[PDB]
Amino acid sequence: DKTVRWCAVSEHEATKCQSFRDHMKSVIPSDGPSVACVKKASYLDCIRAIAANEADAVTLDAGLVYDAYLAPNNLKPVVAEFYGSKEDPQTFYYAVAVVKKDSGFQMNQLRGKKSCHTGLGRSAGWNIPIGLLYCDLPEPRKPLEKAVANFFSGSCAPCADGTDFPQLCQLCPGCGCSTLNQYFGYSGAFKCLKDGAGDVAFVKHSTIFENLANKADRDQYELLCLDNTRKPVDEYKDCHLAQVPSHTVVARSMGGKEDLIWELLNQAQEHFGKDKSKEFQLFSSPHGKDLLFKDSAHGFLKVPPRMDAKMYLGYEYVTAIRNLREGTC
Numbered sequence: 001d002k003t004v005r006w007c008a009v010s011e012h013e014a015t016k017c018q019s020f021r022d023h024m025k026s027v028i029p030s031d032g033p034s035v036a037c038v039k040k041a042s043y044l045d046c047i048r049a050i051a052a053n054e055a056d057a058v059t060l061d062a063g064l065v066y067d068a069y070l071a072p073n074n075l076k077p078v079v080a081e082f083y084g085s086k087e088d089p090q091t092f093y094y095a096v097a098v099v100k101k102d103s104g105f106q107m108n109q110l111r112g113k114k115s116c117h118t119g120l121g122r123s124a125g126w127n128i129p130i131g132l133l134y135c136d137l138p139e140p141r142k143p144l145e146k147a148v149a150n151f152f153s154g155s156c157a158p159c160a161d162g163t164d165f166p167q168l169c170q171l172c173p174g175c176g177c178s179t180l181n182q183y184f185g186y187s188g189a190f191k192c193l194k195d196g197a198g199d200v201a202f203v204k205h206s207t208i209f210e211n212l213a214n215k216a217d218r219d220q221y222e223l224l225c226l227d228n229t230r231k232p233v234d235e236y237k238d239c240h241l242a243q244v245p246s247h248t249v250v251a252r253s254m255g256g257k258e259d260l261i262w263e264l265l266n267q268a269q270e271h272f273g274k275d276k277s278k279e280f281q282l283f284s285s286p287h288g289k290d291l292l293f294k295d296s297a298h299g300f301l302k303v304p305p306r307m308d309a310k311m312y313l314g315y316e317y318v319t320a321i322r323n324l325r326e327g328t329c
């Protein structure tokens, strides 16, 4: 029992949150946990709000989980999403680079092309691909935003500072950090490619399948593999940039209500998980894709006691993030 203040980013998430609140009220008893919705403009405002005791929980992509851990925020991961199936849950996913068929360029020929990113600092959309191109970037590589802006001939990198790095919002003027920007996130980054604004979209292996139902529409796209070849989109297991940890819900280190968070989500998945209810779905919405949780998730797993972001993310991934930040070639 008691209320978990979920931090919703912008209108669409706010709408799904309110429906989430209402549906749980109808199934949960008076003595069960409940949801209240707190709307903010960006994930970064949700991170501050939780630290300031204005909200309690928010789901973040793993690259943002690192940032949330840093002082003075010190949030910790408490519940993880899992993908795949309930039968063989995967606590990771694949970062891929999607391009259109016959566009004629490999991964070593990206300079001067136009890029669509899910958002600044996110695993698949940013950390992995920029991490892989880092030394191909021209000096000076600090700040990163500027070297990236000079390598591609225009991008959409949501959450980046368009005032300071205008080329980063060339494909999505303003670099809006929420679903109000139609090119934000996995599906937004894919739309940026499909619409012809960009030449490459840095997304996850499931993105295209979530967006194109026909195999014949999907045959018009391919993946860039690290060996400078291209493969079809079904072949992501042998043509991907990296494997990355799942998105996770974070909470405060003190008075964080981690117990209630797990309690609420565990019940939520039981009533409203994949194919559970005709009334409401935790992992999909008529209002948008990946709102509050990713549409590709199948459920949740509780993170082990007192695990910090660094341990959760793993040495490798943490090393990569660090090396992007200072990083020496």
Ligand SMILES: [Fe+3]
Pocket (backbone or CB within 6 Å): 061, 062, 122, 123, 124, 247
């Ligand atoms: Fe992600």
